């Protein structure tokens, strides 16, 4: 029974690491869409300032 529970631990961990890997892969893409918005917005702001300051 001890040995068969140990085999079940490794099986349950294998599956839990599948979810952790897919969850991490799902978060990275949402952080990247959020970053590209910030990347684009800051370029767009600072050119509005440079052109406005060339009064």
């Amino acid at each position: 029974g001890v040995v068969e529970n140990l085999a079940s631990e490794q099986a349950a961990r294998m599956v839990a690491m599948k979810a952790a890997t897919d969850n991490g892969g799902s978060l990275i893409k949402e952080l990247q869409l959020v970053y590209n918005k910030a990347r684009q917005a800051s370029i767009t702001q600072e050119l509005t300032e440079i052109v406005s300051g060339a009064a």
Partner: protein, 458 residues
């Protein structure tokens, strides 16, 4: 006497003889084809040129038209003659009915009441709505703002507040439509006439089809009517359909007025233009104004200048979240961002204050756990952390409520919930009396008794 000398969008420049130049905020008048157009004076330039905003469509204006100088500001009807009627920004009747039986007209540009005139009040005003008067209760004579993005629920919430407050309240009311939908103006007017409550309500409409000068000054037409009823010594309810449109119509004209852009391209005057409007909406030792304002949040960005400036103006602030609304929890109030000046142990008393701070503490801790849960899943939590989650999720559902105005969407019938039942329900959930019920038992139930009856049938 005057001549038009430029026309740039909504803005018209007029030249006058230098002995006769109109004052700031004077009304001018000009014949535009087969109709009469009013212009409002904004700036005196040099050489007798004066710069003005058109209260109407500026197309078909030539240069060289003769302009007539009216010796006074824009003045609107006020008093009981305005009750039960729909009016233009210029105070013209917009319903098909006859002329307005005015006895007096008031200029829409006024000074705010002096610091000596103001009055304090702590009379809590009840609402039907579990989250609002639990988390962000408000007083008679105070200001409330509903903040949200596009489509989150600002108007449905204000329509429950009209239903709950403005029909158990007995005095007069003013509804100002500012840059919102014309369909929703017509829909609201008919339900007032069908309910025969119309004869207590004044309606000013300058909806989003109207050119910028209408959208900008219709707010001031709305306040000037409410200030007449307040100075008469009444208690008045003022509803403003979207305050953000007042600022945006300022942005649209500001470049044509020749003002350098500020910040995210706003007018440089944004905080003064908002402040001079907002300070007039105050209860006074002579009489009271209770105010509810919807506040559109552009691109859901609560840090944009226009939302940010509005937050200091108001006594209770309710923030609506797209992320919650897409769950289908309604009203989509964010309880970690909604707040009120009235959530204070002295005015609410301790049981209410402790319940609200308990709910706020559990829901904050659930936000702290969600980044763990998102990667690892919930099984990795501690058995107390799992109990915080198991309670917080119930609390988020019990904040939901069926509205009487929402029956055309949800179908299920509306509920009115007492403050005694709301604090008792959340205090019972946090004490854990109900930890044997499922989450679905709490969703869209009026009171905690209704949750246990729903739980019997799951």
């Amino acid at each position: 006497t005057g001549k038009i000398v430029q026309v740039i969008g909504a803005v018209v420049d007029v030249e006058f003889p230098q002995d006769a130049v109109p004052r700031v905020y004077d009304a001018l008048e000009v014949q535009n084809g087969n109709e009469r157009l009013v212009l409002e004076v904004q700036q005196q330039l040099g050489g007798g040129i004066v710069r003005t905003i058109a209260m109407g469509s500026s197309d078909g204006l030539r240069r060289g038209l003769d302009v007539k100088d009216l010796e006074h500001p824009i003045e609107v009807p006020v008093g009981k003659a305005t009750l039960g009627r729909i009016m233009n920004v210029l105070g013209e009747p917009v319903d098909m009915k006859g002329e307005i039986g005015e006895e007096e007209r008031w200029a829409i540009h006024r000074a705010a009441p002096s610091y000596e005139e103001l009055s304090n009040s702590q009379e809590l005003l009840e609402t039907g709505i579990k989250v609002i008067d639990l988390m962000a209760p408000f007083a008679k004579g105070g200001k409330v703002g509903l903040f949200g993005g596009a489509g989150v629920g600002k108007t449905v919430n204000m329509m429950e507040l009209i239903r709950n407050i403005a029909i158990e309240h007995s005095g007069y009311s003013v509804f100002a439509g500012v840059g919102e939908r014309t369909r929703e103006g017509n829909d609201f007017y008919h339900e007032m006439t069908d309910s025969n409550v119309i004869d207590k309500v004044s309606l000013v409409y300058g909806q989003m089809n109207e050119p910028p000068g209408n959208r900008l000054r219709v707010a001031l037409t709305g306040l000037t009517m409410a200030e007449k009823f307040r100075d008469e010594g009444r208690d008045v309810l003022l509803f403003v359909d979207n305050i953000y449109r007042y600022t945006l119509a300022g942005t649209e004209v500001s470049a044509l007025l020749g003002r350098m852009p500020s910040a995210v391209g706003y007018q440089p005057t944004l905080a003064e233009e908002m402040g001079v409007l907002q300070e007039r909406i105050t209860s006074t030792k002579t009489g009271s104004i209770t105010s509810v304002q919807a506040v559109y949040v552009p691109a859901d960005d609560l840090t944009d200048p226009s939302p940010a400036t509005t937050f200091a103006h108001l006594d209770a602030t309710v923030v609506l979240s797209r992320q919650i609304a897409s769950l289908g929890i309604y009203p989509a109030v964010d309880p970690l961002d909604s707040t009120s000046r009235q959530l204070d142990p002295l005015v609410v008393g301790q049981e209410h204050y402790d319940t609200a701070r308990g709910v706020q503490s559990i829901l904050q801790r659930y936000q702290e756990l969600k980044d763990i849960i998102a990667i690892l899943g919930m099984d990795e939590l501690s058995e107390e952390d799992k109990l915080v989650v198991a309670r917080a999720r119930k609390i988020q559902r019990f904040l939901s409520q069926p509205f009487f105005v929402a029956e055309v969407f949800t179908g299920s019938p509306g509920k009115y919930v007492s403050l005694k039942d709301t604090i008792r329900g959340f205090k019972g959930i946090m004490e854990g009396e109900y930890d044997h019920l499922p989450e679905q038992a709490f969703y869209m139930v009026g009171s905690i008794e209704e949750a246990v009856e729903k739980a019997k049938k799951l």
